[PDB]
A paper describes a structure:
Mirolysin is a secretory protease of Tannerella forsythia, a member of the dysbiotic oral microbiota responsible for periodontitis. T. forsythia secretes a family of six multidomain proteases: three serine proteases (mirolase, miropsin-1, and miropsin-2) and three metalloproteases (karilysin, mirolysin, and forsilysin), referred to as KLIKK proteases. Mirolysin, together with other M43B proteases, archetypal ulilysin and human pappalysins (pregnancy-associated plasma proteases) that hydrolyse growth hormone-binding proteins, shares unique specificity for Xaa–Arg and Xaa–Lys (P1–P1′) peptide bonds, and thus is dubbed LysargiNase17. In this study, we show that mirolysin latency is achieved by a “cysteine-switch” mechanism exerted by Cys23 in the N-terminal profragment.
To determine the molecular mechanism of the interaction of cpd 9 with mirolysin, the crystal structure of the inhibitory complex was solved. The obtained data allowed us to solve the structure in the P1 space group, representing six protein molecules in the asymmetric unit. All molecules show evidence of bound cpd 9, represented by electron density in the difference electron-density map (Fo – Fc) close to the active site of the enzyme. Although the coverage of the fragments by electron density differs for the different protein molecules in the presented structure, unambiguous placement of cpd 9 was achieved for each protein molecule in the unit cell. Cpd 9 is inserted deep in the S1′ subsite of the substrate-binding pocket formed by Asp94, Leu181, Tyr216, Arg220, Thr221, His224, Tyr286, Thr287, and Met292. The main binding contributions come from a hydrogen bond between the backbone carbonyl of Thr287 and the primary amine of cpd 9, water-mediated interaction of the cpd 9 primary amine and the Asp289 side chain, and π–π stacking interactions of the Tyr286 side chain and the ring system of the fragment, as well as π–alkyl interaction of Leu181 with the same moiety of cpd 9. As in the case of the product complex of mature mirolysin, Lys at P1′20, the amino group of cpd 9 interacts with Thr287 and Asp289 at the bottom of the S1′ pocket, but additionally, the aromatic ring of cpd 9 interacts with Leu181 and Tyr286 in the walls forming the S1′ subsite. However, in stark contrast to Arg and Lys side chains, cpd 9 does not contain an aliphatic straight-chain, aside from the amine group, but instead contains an aromatic ring, which fits well into the deep and spacious S1′ subsite in the mirolysin substrate-binding pocket. Cpd 9 and cpd 10 inhibited mirolysin with a Ki of 3.2 and 22 µM, respectively.
Residue numbers in the entry: 59 to 177, 179 to 327
The structure:
């Protein structure tokens, strides 16, 4: 497979000094996305051998924009002082300059990552099916305490995996347990993710079983699309990789336009 290139702009929207996170912290997150989406994450050593053969390399590269929407030079990082103290998922106010946030850069050409103070919410995504109706709010929001790996990020969500999970949703992946409140009925529509009752939290011991997969090697609680601690997640499946890449299909791909100028938007 050929590398899919994603131009990124990180909108730091800060009401105080703590929210105005460091360049190092932002570069740390860009690096984590590149590791997790190219299976160059060192904690792939924690992937059980039973699931190692299902492990996907998405071969998606994330580069900070070097050309802004007016065609001027940028480092792909915006900093917006805000009078708003906590942002709302329901309002999407972080995504509008008009409401004390920062307007999206053309969502057909850039992945917009908003960093801000959110309401015990780690972050939220918008799914591709919503793009036609909600073009301005396409992208990913991350809580400033859970952006980037180590540094200023707070345990136990301190390895940058909130953004990996949210970019997952942004590329059309569903919760591995099927958003069915614990049943075996719901599906993530991925053949190589074992059927799973409910979400996992914390760091379960391998193997974790439930009424849906009651046998070793159990459910893939170390999948990025579960709700487990950052240090206890370490793969996408080949099935998940195919779903994500299909959005960039040159004929039918919802996000295909992103590839046309990706190189020019990320090259000096
Ligand atoms: N572990 C990934 C993740 C992303 C977003 C919200 C979450 N709640 S708990 N785990 C989450
Ligand atoms: Ca599945
Ligand atoms: Ca389920
Ligand atoms: Zn989720």
């Amino acid at each position: 497979s050929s590398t899919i290139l994603i131009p990124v702009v990180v909108h730091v929207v800060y009401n105080n000094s703590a929210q105005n996170i460091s360049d190092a912290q932002i570069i740390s997150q860009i690096q984590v996305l590149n590791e997790d989406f190219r299976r160059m994450n060192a904690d792939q050593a924690n992937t059980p051998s039973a699931f190692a053969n299902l492990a996907g390399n998405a071969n998606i590269e994330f580069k900070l924009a070097r050309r802004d929407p007016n065609g001027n030079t940028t480092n792909g990082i915006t900093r917006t002082s805000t009078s708003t103290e906590t942002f709302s998922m329901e309002m999407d106010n972080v995504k509008f300059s008009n409401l004390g946030g920062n307007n999206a850069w053309n969502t057909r050409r850039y992945l917009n990552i908003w960093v801000c103070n959110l309401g015990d919410l780690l972050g939220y995504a918008q799914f591709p099916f919503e793009f036609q109706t909600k073009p301005n709010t396409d992208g990913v929001v991350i809580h400033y305490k859970h952006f980037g790996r180590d540094g200023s990020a707070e345990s136990p969500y301190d390895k940058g995996r909130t953004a990996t999970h949210e970019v997952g949703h942004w590329l059309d992946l569903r919760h591995i347990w099927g958003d069915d409140g614990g049943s075996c009925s719901g599906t993530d529509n991925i053949a190589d993710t074992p059927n799973q009752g409910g979400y996992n939290e914390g760091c379960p011991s391998f193997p974790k079983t439930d009424h849906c997969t009651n046998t070793s090697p159990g459910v893939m609680f170390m999948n990025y699309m579960d709700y487990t601690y950052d240090a206890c997640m370490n793969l996408f499946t080949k099935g998940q990789v195919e779903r994500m890449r299909s959005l960039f299909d040159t004929q039918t791909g919802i996000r295909r336009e992103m590839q046309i100028y990706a190189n020019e938007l990320t090259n000096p």
